[PDB]
Symmetry: C2
Subunit: 239 residues, 2 copies
């Protein structure tokens, strides 16, 4: 379980895999927040998440994961699970609470809508994709029930965004880590993958377009697609 | 929607349902942290989580949920989703970060092991229980794959608790909201429900017992079992 020669932690390192339509919807989450805050970071493209050295970073053996220097720069720390990477980046780099929440009131709603995604739509979408593509046997009654549960989550988000002045999920005024966490599983392209007509949730669709127009979000989607298709296929990408 | 006349927010209100074997595994989580920190609170036993007035508090229409006064008293705050209720209580009441984490390094590990439960074991256990008991049709291949996924999660927790000096999931020295979130789904009674032999994860079983011996945890289990079975069946308890 020796670390590859090219893995060093001089700044925040974000672990990703080769970019595909179905490999980027969790890794893009911390990348959006890094781009929003302009955090200096490296990208490490993992060839095999099953590799022992990677399990020492993330024992759940998935991307995204982060290695970073401690605030005083003496030690190294780690974040894994997409929602945990958002919480870490906000803690370490969002001192103004622009995306993390400035007070107990803001953080109460951010944590409600962030946790709703982490517990409900996120894992439901993950199980849908697993049974749809990865499970050796096709289980259509299971796939259909998971698809049905996704529409129930879209219904909750739609109700929220129909509330007066509610331009984003947590706060009225600005997007937060709750919006960043939800976006990849609540946009037209992902809805079409699930076999859903996204137009049935108009305020949710409008919200997805508004999030999509943010320069940091555009930069994140642009970059995450390219990782592992460049000059260097695997390992630490050239800064 | 108009609230019941007995629903007033003079302090933290924890929304629960009548105590049964199958109704307490999520509501016990915020109650453990309230007992650990000695947070003043009220208990509201919800008769119907389908009630329109309740969906104004939690749009996911489940317990636990919280109403509380904002620190400055200007707003009524809400928390819903079991993990969010832990985050809220920690934010509002855990001044020293005893359960929430005192520094960026502590919080990085607490949030890792808390989110593992929120995203992996929690929803996996929920889907196992749904397909096992609630789904009109029995889908054994789905139930078996979910049961398998539970054993993989126990394997991860076992690995962690085998690391030198790692007495708790997040921190070596003390339990955190990560441990509180995990306990209800990683103890002998729950393992037995899943048809698993909990002895096959010895360090995880030792950890569950260590958590279980805490006075706050004992009080929380006792109280959550009893809600709705005292003087009052539904509404604000006295």
């Amino acid at each position: 379980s020796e670390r590859p020669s090219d893995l060093v932690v001089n700044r925040l390192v974000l672990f990703v895999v080769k970019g595909t339509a179905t490999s980027t919807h969790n890794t893009v989450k911390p990348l959006i927040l890094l781009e929003e805050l302009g955090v200096p970071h490296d990208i490490y493209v993992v060839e095999k998440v099953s590799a022992p050295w990677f399990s020492e970073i993330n024992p759940h053996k998935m991307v995204p994961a982060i290695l970073d220097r401690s605030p005083d720069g003496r030690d190294t720390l780690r974040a894994w699970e997409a929602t945990s990477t958002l919480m870490y980046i906000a803690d370490a780099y969002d001192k103004d609470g622009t995306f993390g929440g400035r007070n107990v009131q803001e953080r109460s709603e951010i944590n409600n809508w962030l946790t709703l995604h982490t517990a409900a739509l996120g894992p439901t979408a993950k199980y849908w994709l697993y049974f749809y593509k990865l499970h050796p046997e096709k289980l259509p009654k299971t796939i259909e029930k998971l698809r049905s549960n996704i529409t129930v989550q879209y219904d909750i988000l739609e109700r929220r965004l129909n509330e007066p002045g509610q331009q984003y999920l947590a706060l009225k005024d600005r997007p937060t880590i709750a919006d960043i966490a939800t976006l990849p599983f609540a946009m037209k392209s992902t809805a079409e993958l699930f076999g859903l007509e996204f137009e049935k949730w108009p305020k949710l669709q409008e919200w997805s377009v508004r999030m999509g127009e943010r320069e940091a979000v555009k930069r994140a989607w642009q970059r995450v697609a390219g990782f592992g298709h460049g000059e260097k296929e695997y390992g630490m990408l050239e800064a």
